[PDB]
Amino acid sequence: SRSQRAGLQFPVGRIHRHLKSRTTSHGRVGATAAVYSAAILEYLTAEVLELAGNASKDLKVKRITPRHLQLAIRGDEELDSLIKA
Amino acid sequence: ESYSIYVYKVLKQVHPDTGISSKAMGIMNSFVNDIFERIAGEASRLAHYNKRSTITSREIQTAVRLLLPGELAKHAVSEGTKAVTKYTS
Amino acid sequence: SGLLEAEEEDEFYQTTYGGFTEESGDDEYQGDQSDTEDEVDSDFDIDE
């Protein structure tokens, strides 16, 4: 599976399928682009879930919840701007 | 599409012992999908604007730098480069 | 930076991804719809 080859838990392959779906006429997507998108997605999700598990005063969350997600992103004002973009 | 399983895998990566509800991963699905859309759209915009019919490491990297705010852009670019190296190598 | 965003309204968050507020009927996500395995098409290894 191409996902582990990139060390990415997310599907670089289905991701590249989506990329092809969202290209212009004759608009192709390189494998490097597929894995790059999967990697940025994995890192963003990793930071968001890291702070969501840590989205609390005790810095640990048993079950990640929408509120924990708002705290992770909003409190991560970088992610606040990124999502609000 | 369907990425919730890989969402949980990344959650284990960051937090091997953290569970998460159904709607919380729905929110993650929306978040990842929309950021994925932003990146792919910017990359295809550059490809269409340029003679590059291809979307490559250059395209996704430039899109990541353009969209993400500062340190986020730096981290995302570094991770994309690292994963491109991993996959290509 | 934590309190500065709180004093102001976070209406954007309130309407983001079906809301970020805690709700009911939110089961611990069980698993896939039987589509967990990744998939490709014939043109991933195409040169750039």
Author numbering:
A (entry chain N): 18 to 102
B (entry chain O): 35 to 123
C (entry chain K): 18 to 65
Sentences from the paper on this structure:
With the goal of structural and functional characterization of the TIP60 complex, we purified the native, endogenous complex from K562 cells that had been genome engineered to produce a tagged version of the enhancer of polycomb homolog 1 (EPC1) subunit specific to TIP60 (28). Our structural model of the endogenous TIP60 complex does not include the trimer independent of NuA4 involved in transcription interactions with nucleosomes (TINTIN) module, and only a small segment of the HAT module could be traced (EPC1), as they are flexibly tethered to the rest of the complex. As is also the case for the yeast NuA4 complex, the HAT module is flexibly tethered to the P400 subcomplex through a previously identified region within EPC1 (49–54). We found that our reconstructions did not include density for the transformation/transcription domain-associated protein (TRRAP) either.
The human Tat-interactive protein, 60 kDa (TIP60) complex, a fusion of the yeast nucleosome acetyltransferase of histone H4 (NuA4) and switch/sucrose nonfermentable related 1 (SWR1) complexes, is involved in both histone acetylation and H2A.Z-H2B histone exchange and is essential for cell viability, playing a role, among other cellular processes, in gene regulation and DNA double-strand break repair. TIP60 consists of five modules, including TINTIN, HAT, TRRAP, ARP, and BASE, each with distinct functions. Within the complex, the EP400 protein functions as a major scaffold, making interactions with all the functional and structural modules, a role similar to that of the Eaf1 subunit in the yeast NuA4 complex and of the Swr1 subunit in the SWR1 complex, the two subunits of which EP400 is a merge.
